[PDB]
Design a binder for these strands. Structure first.
Lengths: 213, 150, 165
RNA sequence: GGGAUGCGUAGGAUAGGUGGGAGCGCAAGCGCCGGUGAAAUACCACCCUUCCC
RNA sequence: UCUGGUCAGCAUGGC
RNA sequence: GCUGCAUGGCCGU
RNA sequence: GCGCCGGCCAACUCCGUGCCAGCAGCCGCGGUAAUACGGAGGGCGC
RNA sequence: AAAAAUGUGAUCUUGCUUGUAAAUACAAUUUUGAGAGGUUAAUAAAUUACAAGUAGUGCUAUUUUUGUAUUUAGGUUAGCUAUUUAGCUUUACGUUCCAGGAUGCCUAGUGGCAGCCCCACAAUAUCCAGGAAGCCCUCUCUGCGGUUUUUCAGAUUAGGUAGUCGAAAAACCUAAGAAAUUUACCUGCU
């Protein structure tokens, strides 16, 4: 909740993670919060994207739907590119489309393309919450890609709680806290009660145990 | 009752007594001639429309029309209950023939200068080959009434 | 001279009292194709025992005239029922249209009348300048000199088309 | 809180959800992939329904 | 039996 | 014109 | 001389009358053909 | 309705709740004759249209060619009696006359007939039973209805039972004073 308290949470979490000094691979930090006194039945549920101020550390898988330029940038970035030609083909084959949707967290699409993508893709993508974000045809993707990586999705579903990826072991405790704050901000905005709803908050490394704020 | 059963001379065309009775039912004002004609013409109608011989069609009709049981009122201690009872064999014919002619008159179709088609159609409708028509209705209705108050 | 001569100013036919075109708008139909125009009027006098007690009344009345419409009407008009076309029938002023009057309160009024000559015909005769009296302005009054006389009046019409009787 | 539980159709099947996920495991198996579907499933978590303590 | 019907078919007492 | 309760006759029932 | 003449009870007709006037022992009689009221003729009784 | 294509940010539509809008008519015969007064007092059914929210579904969201057209229809949710068929009228519970509209449901097929495009037969149940007339009665003109007061002897010659209100009169209806007074069934005494 308060910055100092979260800093302790984060600091403690890092120390606890063990087995060895640290796993060979860099673990990631997850923030989990439980909510209270909110009816999940109503549109109280939260599904939203948050741009973390310091990126996720993984830079979320992103797909780009578009043509030259936009497609070129996507390839340079190393992102999957779905070309304009493929859109109809994918609408036809649900089998592939389903797989594509499951694999990536976010989709970015050339804005002009939006009519076609919803016509063909929308049935699969929309239910998922996967619908693409439009960007101008001659936009610069890099900043967006960074944010979306460096973007994370908060999806409560009907359940009372949420788990989100806040950062990496690589990043500083200060950064992790800043990212956590961005997440917290969304909840504060959604309900009138605000943060009061948060029953309990916890931080945890991949391997490490959760520690309550 | 009215009188002793007088025997009726059998029909000139097919010497069937039952037919004459039917003819009597049709006739009124003693116009015996018109009455015979209507029945004969109907028989001809039965021949064309239906492959079967008219005499057979008619007899079958009467059979469908005769009520087996009828309800007669009677005064019991309270109210007059309608006792169901069998019907005399003599009674059944008079009812059947009478009901045919009445239902036949009932038909909308006004065919032949006279009534003759209504009789023709009525009889066929009666047959149980076709056991429909107004005549059969009355018959079925009476039987239904009986055994309702079994 | 020509001025003095008598001509007919406005006549106007009319119809009986009561509602008109009761079954359907009718009775106006007569008066229609007759005289060329179609007037309608209304009435006052609410409680009528066998009349209405309607206030504003549909009551049929109508027609008028001009010059020349009532000529070519009042042609094949007179030469209609006139047991006595004229005599006592019309009076001092010039022309009239009547029948037998009834004892009713008369005289102190503008003098419209029930009187029925034909489907109450109204030939009104006036000579002269007379537009003087009628017209709004210095009205003036008829001279009671150059006024119509029944004798003169039962002249003119009579000279033409039909006998005085 | 701990152990259970969740049966339209399609989907090798009883899919309560959502986020992470290209892997978990010596292997077998399991998952990804492929596919069906409105939604995808291993594995790690969090939020639920109902039942038990 | 009904003071049945008819003095208006006719007849007939009385008024 | 009265009285069929003053009657004949005749008739209905 | 006197009573009576509808039945009981022997002795009957006319007229007057018109539920009136009247009669009446009981039953009753008189509302226009009254042997019952009143007179008369006639009759019965004594 | 069918076909093809662009394409609004792919795309896609069966519904639930709130707000506003309009029809569903009415007159007439007949009634104590007419008009006026609350056709009341009551409480208003439900069909379609647009907007928003919402599961839906990203919301408004196109153009060109072809046959008349080759589409779905039709019915169905009126009352009453009835154990079924059916029947009666055709829908009534404030009383009289009438429309069935929602969803969901039924036949797409069977029987007669030479044949049929020719005749017959199915259909649950919840929704509102809605609309007009119509309202003990009151005032006026003033109503073939019907008021106001009085008298009541006595049946060709009289009585016994009795004749729509016991009868009759004159008259009242914006005013009611006022005065005369029957009979049918049926019969008698000396």
């Amino acid at each position: 909740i308060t910055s100092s308290q979260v800093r302790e949470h984060v600091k403690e979490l890092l120390k606890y993670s063990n087995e060895t000094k640290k796993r060979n691979f860099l673990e990631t930090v997850e923030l989990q919060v439980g909510l209270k006194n909110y009816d999940p039945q109503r549109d109280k549920r939260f599904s939203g994207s948050l741009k973390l101020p310091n990126c996720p550390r993984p830079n979320m898988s992103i797909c780009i739907f578009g043509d030259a330029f936009d497609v070129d940038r996507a390839k340079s970035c190393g992102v999957d590119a779905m070309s304009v030609d493929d859109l109809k083909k994918l609408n036809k084959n649900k089998k592939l489309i389903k797989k594509l949707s499951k694999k990536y967290n976010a989709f970015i699409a050339s804005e002009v393309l939006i009519k076609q993508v919803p016509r063909l893709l929308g049935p699969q993508l929309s239910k998922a919450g996967k619908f693409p974000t439009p960007v101008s045809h001659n936009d610069d993707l890099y900043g967006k890609v960074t944010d979306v990586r460096s973007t994370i999705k908060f999806q409560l579903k009907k359940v009372l709680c949420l788990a989100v990826a806040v950062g990496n072991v690589e990043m500083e405790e200060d950064v992790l806290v800043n990212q956590i704050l961005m997440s917290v901000n969304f909840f504060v905005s959604l309900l009138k009660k605000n943060w009061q709803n948060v029953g309990s908050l916890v931080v945890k490394s991949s391997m490490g145990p959760a520690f309550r704020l | 009752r009215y009188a002793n059963k007088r025997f009726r001379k059998a029909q000139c065309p097919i010497i069937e007594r039952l037919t004459n009775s039917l003819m009597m039912n049709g006739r009124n004002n003693g116009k015996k001639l018109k009455a015979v004609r209507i029945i004969k013409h109907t028989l001809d109608i039965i021949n064309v429309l239906t492959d079967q011989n008219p005499i057979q069609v008619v007899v079958d009709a009467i059979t469908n029309t005769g009520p087996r049981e009828d309800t007669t009122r009677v005064g019991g201690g309270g109210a007059a209950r309608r006792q169901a009872v069998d019907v005399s064999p003599l009674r059944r014919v008079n009812q059947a023939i009478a009901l045919l002619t009445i239902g036949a008159r009932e038909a909308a179709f006004r065919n032949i200068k006279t009534i003759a088609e209504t009789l023709a159609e009525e009889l066929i409708n009666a047959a149980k080959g076709s056991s429909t028509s107004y005549a059969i209705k009355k018959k079925d209705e009476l039987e239904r009434v009986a055994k309702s108050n079994r | 001279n020509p001025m003095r001569d008598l001509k007919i100013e406005k006549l106007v036919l009319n119809i009986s009292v009561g509602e008109s075109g009761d079954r359907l708008t009718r009775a106006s139909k007569v008066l229609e194709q007759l005289s060329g125009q179609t007037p309608v009027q209304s009435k006052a006098r609410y409680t009528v025992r066998t009349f209405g007690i309607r206030r504003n009344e549909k009551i049929a009345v109508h027609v008028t005239v001009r010059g020349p419409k009532a000529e070519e009407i009042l042609e094949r008009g007179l030469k209609v029922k006139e047991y006595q076309l004229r005599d006592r029938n019309f009076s001092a002023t010039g022309n009239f249209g009547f029948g037998i009057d009834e004892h009713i309160d008369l005289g102190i009024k503008y003098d419209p009348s029930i009187g029925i000559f034909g489907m109450d015909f109204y030939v009104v005769m006036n000579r002269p300048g007379a537009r003087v009296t009628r017209r709004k302005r210095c009205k003036g009054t008829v001279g009671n000199s150059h006024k119509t006389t029944k004798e003169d009046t039962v002249s003119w019409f009579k000279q033409k088309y039909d006998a005085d009787v």
